[PDB]
Each structure stands twice: as structure tokens, then as C-alpha cells.
Amino acid sequence: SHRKFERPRHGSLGFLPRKRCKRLRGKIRSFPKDDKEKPPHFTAFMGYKAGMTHIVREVDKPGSKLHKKEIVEACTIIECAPMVVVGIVGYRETPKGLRILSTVWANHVSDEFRRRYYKNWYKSEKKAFTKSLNVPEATKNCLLKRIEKYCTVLRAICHTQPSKTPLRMKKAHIMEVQINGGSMKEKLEFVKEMLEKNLPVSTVFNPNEMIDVISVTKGHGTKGVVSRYGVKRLPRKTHRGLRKVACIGAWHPARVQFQIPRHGQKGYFHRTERNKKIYRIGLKTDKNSASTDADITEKKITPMGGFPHYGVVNEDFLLLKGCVAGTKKRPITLRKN
Amino acid sequence: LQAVRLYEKGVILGYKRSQRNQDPNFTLISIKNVNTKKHAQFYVGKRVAYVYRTTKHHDGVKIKCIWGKVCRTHGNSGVIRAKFKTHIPPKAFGDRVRILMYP
Amino acid sequence: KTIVSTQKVLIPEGVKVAINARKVTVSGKYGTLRRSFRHLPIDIRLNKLKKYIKVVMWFGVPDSLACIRTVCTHLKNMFTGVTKKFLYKMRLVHAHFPINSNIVDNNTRIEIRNYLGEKSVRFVKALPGVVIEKSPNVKDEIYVSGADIENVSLTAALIHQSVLCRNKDIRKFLDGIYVSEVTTV
Amino acid sequence: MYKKEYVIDCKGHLLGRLASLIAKELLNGQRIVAVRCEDINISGSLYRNKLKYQEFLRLRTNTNPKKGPLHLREPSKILWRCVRGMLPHKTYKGQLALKKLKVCVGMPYPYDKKKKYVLPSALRAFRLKKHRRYCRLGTLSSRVGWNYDTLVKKNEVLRKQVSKAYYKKKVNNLNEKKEIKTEALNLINPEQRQVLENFGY
RNA sequence: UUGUUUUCACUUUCUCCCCGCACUAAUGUGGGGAAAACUGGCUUUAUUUCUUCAAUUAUUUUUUUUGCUGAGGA
RNA sequence: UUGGAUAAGGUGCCUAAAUAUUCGCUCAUGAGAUCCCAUAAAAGGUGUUGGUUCAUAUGAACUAGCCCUGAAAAUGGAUGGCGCUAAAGCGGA
RNA sequence: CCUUCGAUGUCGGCUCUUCCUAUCAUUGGGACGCAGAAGUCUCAAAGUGUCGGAUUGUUCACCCGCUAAUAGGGAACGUGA
RNA sequence: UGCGAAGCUAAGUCUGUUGGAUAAUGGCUGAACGCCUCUUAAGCCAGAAACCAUGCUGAUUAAACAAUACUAUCUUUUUUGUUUGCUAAUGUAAAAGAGAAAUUAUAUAUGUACCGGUACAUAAAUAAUCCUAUCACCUUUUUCGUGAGCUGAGCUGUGAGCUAGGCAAUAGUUCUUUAACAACAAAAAAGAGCACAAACUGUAGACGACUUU
């Protein structure tokens, strides 16, 4: 028979299976779309756990009770150890999906990036990327011509540089960042100048726009239903313990449905956070970047006492709405809206 | 060039069966260019050779043939029933058979 | 039920026609005519010095023996309409608020306001190459026109159904956008 | 039936009739490659077949939809599943017959220039009254979530252009081969000439 | 509580004419009439291989290509 | 046991045999599809066709085949499945 | 009284999941004896949600309130290793 | 008693999208039936928390796959064969000419030339078609094309021929016509690094696994 008292189900079925993520980085399923009218620019960035803090503001929404009066807010200030652009990937559309035509590597590749291709770098011969970077420019011109002729999606292989961070890890994190714009014949020039250097943010990251964050949540190992799904605790009188789901299914179907909360892994999940509007542009070295003309004191992105379980931050800063998932030292991926 | 043919192609369908009941004495065979009972009747006395290959030699040769002949037509779409000296193994269903021009 | 069903059209003297693959190509005065009728089984007999179109259905059983009647009056009205523009007679209607019209962009993207005082944005379109525009005689009248029957007709059809209100009794709340009569240039 | 493999153009073909013919061929042992499966026609209104596919979609194992009926929205996979439903895929011979079939949308690389055959027993123009309603498998798949219909069309038009150019070359080659036949004939001896004429060569 | 007979109305056409005079689906048509009857049927003549001599039933005589079977041992 | 030929039932594929021939009917935004058998009614029907009846090529009233409404239940779902509409449906031959 | 008496754990509540629609609210509509409100009849629709307590073992019930609504049911009268 | 870094933790803070066809309704035309008439006639549009996408989570859910980086003595032709548990070695779901590239419309399409239109051709049992097969050998007279080496072009080889010549098959009546493809073994000729473990880490954790040095 029906339940006496209805209540919404415990947890969301849209985040199943609640298993450990296969990787540590935050992978992007989907990049922002492109349009014919729009002009060609960049698409995404990356970094590490930077800080999600307050900043004092003032509403201007017509009809609020705060408006002119001061408000306090919440947003994030982001980290950019300059990513290094080392590769280009071309993808073309097929009925079986979007498929790689080819990837072209830069003439000179760093050692942090090379270290990612190894499990024991200290004991290896460091032979990766040793005879594939001395190819003639003729093959480059013979296949980049095919890239524009056949491919519809262009991505740039970029890698972080953890040596600029207090991380123990020495391998670089590698990802690919799309490129967006309008018509193909306007991309050939624009994809021919920034193919080796590192990444300064201010080219595209601009005030009054929205971006999203993607990362891996903290790990908590195996946890019960009461913590994994937040089910109701059983009364103290329960015989074989109270931290469980009482009925895990009706008699029929004669099986346990996949919608029943069970014990298992919680945390170390893959998540994306939406609707974070970017607000401000800044740098790493400059001194008048974070404070304003109303306060005119002396201080910047710099922290105090040392960042607990992280270290000291010595790279760039910006401003963006929200707060961020994952633990300290975790790689965070920053996509646009 | 070489290897003259002088035989007609056929494919071994299943046995002479009903739904969920088989009679392995007769095997159904479809002939290359016959599609009517009247044309299938043209091949009655003709011998049928099922020539298959084995994994190892048996008389210094890797090829074994079993013999039969077409006894009658089956249906009205140019399918014949053939009777062989030994029953066709069901692993041979869909395999190629030779409707020889003799007698 | 019988075998040959057809009508001998009388081609207007002010047009000149031709046929290919149930795609009739005609020329009148305002322009040229074609249309896709490949949903129906249709054959054509045609003359030009002696003229008259014949659209013929073979073995037409009565359920689809009315496809012919439709097109036989329709195309016969088509050339007449493209010669002499078909003019319906629509009145913009209002009981309280005389209608506000912001006709931007040369008969294209027509606007409607001052209809129950919502003071918001509303716009229903029409066919390209067909005019539904204010008659200078009376402000409460927008004369329609065009060359095709459907051209002059959907442009009077899509409009009655565009700015309808809510929670009012039409038996006493007589709001609408009326279409009454048909005339010609 | 007696070829190495048969390539079938599925354009303008009724789904069930085509599937039955293909299934019988596969069971008899003929390998079939079905191309342009997105142009398969189905009798009945597009909304009717849409309702049928939604009825199929709402069908899943309640305990674990992972084990439930996979829905396979690509039109080639739809034709493949329809064919599988018409052969005993639970048996070894039926599984072999099922694996002897290849289904594609459009014409991939090794099917640009092999002959595409047509089964007239399943053509819409011969199997459906003209006044009756039919749908298109590509459109139905796009309505139920295939979303690759436009790309297949744009690849198909490039294929059409390539085939147009190469057929235009082939007809010139053929008519040159015909006009060399004319004076290859009258230079041949009369006794062979007469045989060739009277036997239509 | 019937037989019997009598009365008219029918058919071939690329016949033709007239009216609508091209209105035909056509190398014609909607209507009114004249034509012979090249249609046809009827009675004959010698022939049925120039060409039909069918179909059904009853009563008979064969024939093409072929599947399977060989008990027995007087 | 070996051949032949059939009964019931079938001949689109599953599945051996007709995508047979021949004549009609039907489009269903929950069509229909073999005795037992696996539900369906009252009530509504100017589509088809033969109708039947009466009124001066002219209107209705009935009548009956197919189709539709009436027709709502719980795990996901079953003309046996796929599917089938110039039927592979319904009624004949 | 068809199955089970060499045993299918027989009420209710708690907990938890899913399903149905004969829809309580929410969405978009048609009608009204519809000026507006507030409502009543009805259509497509099961995506989302349907509560806190006093008495009683109770289901049922009945009150006090909140709510937007506090709709009706099934799942071996769902659920006692 | 106290905070109680950080951890863990809510009773706090952060965050929680737009696109397609879509029911009733209203219409265009307009029959049946002179004319009216949403269609119990035919053809065309307006339009919902539902649907499917988008987005998000898995993807040993596809026993799935791609690109890349480095490496493994390795790779191409010929002959003979595959008739201590091992150290030569063979398997076919289908060779017998397994021959065949326009696209499309079905109440006609396809080409060519002009500016969807025009004109002219082609096609309509369309695979009921077309294409490919046997002329062995050697000798001689030579002819026309393709490759090695050589400087649009000379020579050799190759493929197809022309003239003329003389030269072979035989196993007793058939038991598959041993004829295909792929692989392997031996012998010849030619060319051609990483991971686990260990210690550390703790962004991880029941153990594996995972993140690191």
C-alpha cells in the first residue's frame, strides 16, 4: 500500500554511481558553443586551489532594501600559475562522434610536461619527446592546411607548471582548451602566433561575464547511509543498530532497486559548479590591484601566516563569484559559461 | 582460365524440417539461378557433391567429399530436397555444394 | 464511383502558363507562379494558343476526389488574384483602448499595443510579399492585399489569434480583431 | 546469396520488409552491408512512429535500467535491432547470422564505389499507396535524440558531388569505348561480324 | 382455367449532314436526322494443315525426366 | 525403420512452405490480426458501398460492414516477438 | 475453498524506494447562471510537492494549526533474519 | 574549566541553464449538395511544470575506439614444408568469373546548352544488361602501347598483336576438378626502453586501488 506520509527521496539520482573518480583533474565534458557572427578568441583556463572569499560591495538592484547601503558578498579570487601552450589538436565531426585528425606539438617542450608521461621519471632515460620535436616545418604546413580544411574543433594542449607552486608533485597537469569564434577562414591567422608561449589571462577574462568551476570533491572513504544520503536515523531501541535504511525495497520486484541508498564511497566525486560571474581583472606583481581608492592602504593578493596545508601564493589574481569544491592542493579547472 | 567448372552452385539450407521438428534424412538446397518449382524440377537425377576441407590429411589429401543427389523439389521457389549417403552435419548449413551436370 | 474526373479551367487572358512534373509555371503581371502539389495524384492537359488548363484525376474515388475541386477553384483564383490583388477587409477592434500600432520596418515585424493596457511587447508576422497596412481613410482599418489566395489569406488568418487576453467574457467583452469582407483592387 | 557481400542502399525502403529480406539472406549465409540507413521509410505517420518509439523508450528494467532494453537511437542501429528481432540471435547460428550484417548511416569509405543494390519488394514506391502516410527513419531518430542527421546530410551532398564528377568521367569513357567499337567492327571479318550482329552484340 | 399467337425496340460503323459550329479524352464530342449492313445472323455448296475443332464428363491407349526399395533363395 | 502423400494448422522473418493469384473494405494522436482464449456494453456516427423507402437528375429518413468516441491501475511489456498499411489487417475466392 | 497445516511469521506505527491517475496544488487551456475578485465544470498533463500536533494500539476517525496543497491508491493489506 | 588550528562537521556560506516538434482552441482554402461549409473531404500555420535534446554523473554501462610520446634486434622477396608437457609447423560459417560507383522521381526522371524557368536529347520487362574468360609451345616476318637504365626523345623489358612453320597432350569409365585465402616453421637474399617492487607522500584509503617524490 501507499506511504502514509510522502517526502522527497534522499539524494539525487543524477550523480550516480557514487564511485571514486577515475582521475584527479577535473575533466570538462562540454565547452561553450561557437557562433558564426562572433569573433575568434580563447575559451578556458586552469589553475590550483586559490581562495574563495568575501568582498565588500553595494547593491544597485532597483527596489532592494540594501541598495545604496553597503553589503558583504562572497566570490572567489583565482590562481594562475601561467599555463604553457605546447600542442594543438584538430577534431572533425563524424556520425560516430567528434574525432581527432592530428595533434601538432611545439618545437620545444618543457621538462615538467615531459615528466607527466612517466611513472618512474627518476629512473628513466628521459627519452620522451626526443626525436618527434625535430621534424621539418614542411610537415607542419602540409597538415595544418588539412586542419582548417577538414577539422571543425580546435583545441590547445596546455600544461601547468607545479614548480611555481608549493606542490610536492613535479609532473605537470595536461589538458586541452578549445578555441571559439566564427568563420573558419578567420582562424588560420589567429591560430598562428601564440602557439609556444605561456598564458596571460587578461586577453579574454574580463569583468561582467560568467564562468564555471570543475574539480574533484574531497574523499571520505566508505561511509554509511546516514552520511552518504542523509537518511533518517532509526530509533535508539533498534536491535541491530540504528544507522541504516530500515526497508530496502518491497517484496516485489524481488530485487533491490538501484534507487535505494546503500553504504559505500562518499566524496572524491566529479563535480561542476555553474553560474559564477567574473567581476575584476588583476595581476601577481602589481601593488594597487586588489584594494580600492576608498581604502588606499598597502596590501595585495598576498596571504598572511601561510596558507594552511597549502603554502604561499606567488601568482596572479582576478575576481569571480562563488566557492570551490575539492581539498587543498587540488587541481581546479576553470571553464567559461 | 584453368579449373573448369561444369557444375551449378548451391547452398545448403537446413534439413527437411517442420517447426521445432527435423528430418535429417533430407537436406534442403538452394540452387544458383532457379527460383520456381518448374525450373527446380530440371535437376532431379543430378548428383550433388558436398566438398569440404579438414584440418589434417586423411588420404594424403585435406579435402573430403560426401555424395548425394536431389530427390525432389521443395516448395515452389526453386528449393530442392537432397539425400546424401550420410547426413549433412549441421555445421555445414550455409556452405557451398556442387550440383553436378551428370548424369 | 467512376474513372475520369476533371474540370476544364478557363485560363485568364492576362496570364500565360506551362506545366512540368505537376509543377505549373505561370506568368501573369505581378510575377511568376509555381507551387508544390506532390501530395496529390494529378495530371494536366494544357493548351496555349487555345489556352485553358485541365487538371485531371484518374480513377478518383470520392474521398480524394475533392483534392481536385480544391485546386481547380484554387489555381483558377490564383491567376485572378495575382492579376487583380485580393483585398479582404479587417478592422482593428477595441472597446476601451484605441489600438496602438508601432509598424516598424516596412510592413515587416508589425507591432500591437493598447490592447488591455498591458504595455508590453507583442508582434505577429505575415507572409513576405503580402501587405496588410493602414488604410488612410479610417485609422481603425488595415487593408490587406496580395497576389495569391493564401498570400492574402494567411496574412488575414494569423492575426485574429495573436493578442488574446484572459479571464474576460466574450459575450460582453467584445474585444477582437475582426475580418469581415473580401474585395479587389 | 552467392556473392561475397551485398551492399544495399536503404533509401526509400520500408523498414520491416527490408529487415525481413535481410534477415533471411543472413540466415542463408549472405553477408549484407546496409548503407544510408537514415533514409529508411516507415509506413504510418511520423507522429505514430514517434509514439511507438516513446512507448519503447518508457520501457526499462525497474530494478536496474543498465540491464534494461538498450534503445540505440541511431537509425542504423534501429535497422540492426529490427533485423535481430527477425532471426534467432539466442543460438550460435543466429548469432553468426547477426554478426554477418553491417549497418551504416550514409556511405563510409569502402562503399563509395561498390554497386549498391535495391530490393524492389521493399520499396515504398511499390509497397505503399501514394495517398497514405509514411515517415523517415532519420527524422524519427532526430526526434528521439540522434542529433547527427544534419552532418550525415552534409557528408551525403559531398558524396553526391564526387559521384557526379566521376560518373561524368565514366560516361565519356564509355562513349569513347563505344565509338571505338564501331570501327573495330567493320574491320573484323564478315563471318564474325554477322554472328555479332545477329546475336545482338 | 393454360397453351397459342400478335404488337415495338434493339444492333455494327473510321458513313454523312446540321446546331454548340471545335463545345471532343481521339484523327471529335453533347443534341436531331438521313446511310448501308464494309458488322452480324440466317440457308447452302467441297474441303478443316489457310484458320478454329475448345471445356467438362464417360470410355481407352501411351509418353519425358526421375526418388526410394530388392524380403526370398522353392 | 525407409520412401510417399496428407490431417489439424499454416506459407514476411523468427519457422518448413505464397512478400502467390484474384475481388472488395479499413487509416486508428492507444488500428487489427486463428474455437476453447485470455473482457467489453448501453449510447453516438451526411467517410465507403450496395442498399431500402418514399417526396419533384432533385431531399431526407432509416439500414449495415469497416473505422472512431464511449474505453482509467499500479515493476517495464507484449496480435508470441519483430514488424506489417499496393498488409504481413478484415471478408471471400 | 484452487495453492500452502514435515509452518509463506497473522494489526498498527517507524524507515525507505518505486509505481498508477480516477489531478489536491503547481503549468498551459476551454465553459459558466463569468463585470472584477473569489469560485464551480472540464481538457492536455504524474515533472515537482502533498506537513507539525492533542486523544486512541489502532487502520479508520476527530479536532488544533501551518500550507499552495495538505489528492486518492498499488507494490504478498509493500516493508518483523 | 576553556578556545579548541587543521581535520570532521550545519544549525552557514556558495551554486543549482536554453532549444525542437508539440493537446484543445483559432484559422487559409473549400467540396460533398447550385452555395454555405476546421476536413464524420483533400492539402498549410499560431501555439504547455509533459517529451527529446542541451547541461551534469558514470562509461571493464561499447568484453568500444582514436591521436600522440618512447621502446621491443626488426622489416620485405625465394625454396622446402606444417602428411621432461612441449621446444619445426595449419586454420577457415564458407573461392571455382564469389565480376559490376551516378543521383533521383514514382501522377515520369537524368543529361547538354541557355536565363528554379526554357529548349533539345536520353530512359521506361528497366542485371530479361553489360563486362570478362580457352587462341597452349617453341621458330620466323614484324606492328602498336607501358616500366628498368638513359637524354619532348633514342634503347631494353613488358602487354597486346601480324605473317608463315611444325610441335605436345593419351595413365584403360568418374569417386573433390587436391587449384582459394590467411598463417606458421626452417633455410636463403635484401633493407633496420619501460613497468612492477622498494622507500617517501596523504590531495587517497577496510585491503587492493589512488595522489606524489
mmCIF file of N, CA and C in Angstrom, chain D residues 38 75 136 138-139 141-142 146-154:
data_model
loop_
_atom_site.group_PDB
_atom_site.id
_atom_site.type_symbol
_atom_site.label_atom_id
_atom_site.label_comp_id
_atom_site.label_asym_id
_atom_site.label_seq_id
_atom_site.Cartn_x
_atom_site.Cartn_y
_atom_site.Cartn_z
ATOM 1 N N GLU D 38 19.637 6.012 -42.663
ATOM 2 C CA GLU D 38 18.859 7.151 -42.201
ATOM 3 C C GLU D 38 17.777 7.571 -43.185
ATOM 4 N N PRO D 75 19.688 5.514 -36.530
ATOM 5 C CA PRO D 75 18.848 4.750 -37.466
ATOM 6 C C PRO D 75 19.479 3.450 -37.930
ATOM 7 N N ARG D 136 10.145 9.050 -42.035
ATOM 8 C CA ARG D 136 11.539 8.863 -42.409
ATOM 9 C C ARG D 136 12.339 8.532 -41.160
ATOM 10 N N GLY D 138 15.499 8.759 -40.411
ATOM 11 C CA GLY D 138 16.393 9.805 -39.944
ATOM 12 C C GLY D 138 15.671 10.870 -39.144
ATOM 13 N N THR D 139 14.511 11.310 -39.631
ATOM 14 C CA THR D 139 13.726 12.295 -38.896
ATOM 15 C C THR D 139 13.241 11.736 -37.566
ATOM 16 N N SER D 141 14.675 9.388 -35.756
ATOM 17 C CA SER D 141 15.831 9.321 -34.872
ATOM 18 C C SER D 141 16.202 10.700 -34.347
ATOM 19 N N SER D 142 16.141 11.718 -35.205
ATOM 20 C CA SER D 142 16.409 13.076 -34.752
ATOM 21 C C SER D 142 15.381 13.553 -33.737
ATOM 22 N N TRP D 146 18.809 11.573 -31.879
ATOM 23 C CA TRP D 146 20.009 11.157 -32.597
ATOM 24 C C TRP D 146 20.935 12.336 -32.880
ATOM 25 N N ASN D 147 20.370 13.459 -33.322
ATOM 26 C CA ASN D 147 21.042 14.753 -33.482
ATOM 27 C C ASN D 147 22.290 14.698 -34.366
ATOM 28 N N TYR D 148 22.453 13.647 -35.168
ATOM 29 C CA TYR D 148 23.507 13.597 -36.173
ATOM 30 C C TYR D 148 22.951 13.614 -37.589
ATOM 31 N N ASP D 149 21.683 13.988 -37.760
ATOM 32 C CA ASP D 149 21.056 13.932 -39.075
ATOM 33 C C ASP D 149 21.667 14.945 -40.035
ATOM 34 N N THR D 150 21.904 16.172 -39.568
ATOM 35 C CA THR D 150 22.404 17.219 -40.453
ATOM 36 C C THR D 150 23.800 16.897 -40.969
ATOM 37 N N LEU D 151 24.668 16.381 -40.098
ATOM 38 C CA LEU D 151 26.026 16.052 -40.513
ATOM 39 C C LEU D 151 26.030 14.961 -41.574
ATOM 40 N N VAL D 152 25.169 13.956 -41.413
ATOM 41 C CA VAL D 152 25.062 12.905 -42.416
ATOM 42 C C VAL D 152 24.610 13.486 -43.748
ATOM 43 N N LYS D 153 23.661 14.423 -43.716
ATOM 44 C CA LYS D 153 23.203 15.061 -44.946
ATOM 45 C C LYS D 153 24.333 15.827 -45.625
ATOM 46 N N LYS D 154 25.109 16.579 -44.843
ATOM 47 C CA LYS D 154 26.173 17.379 -45.437
ATOM 48 C C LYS D 154 27.294 16.504 -45.984
#
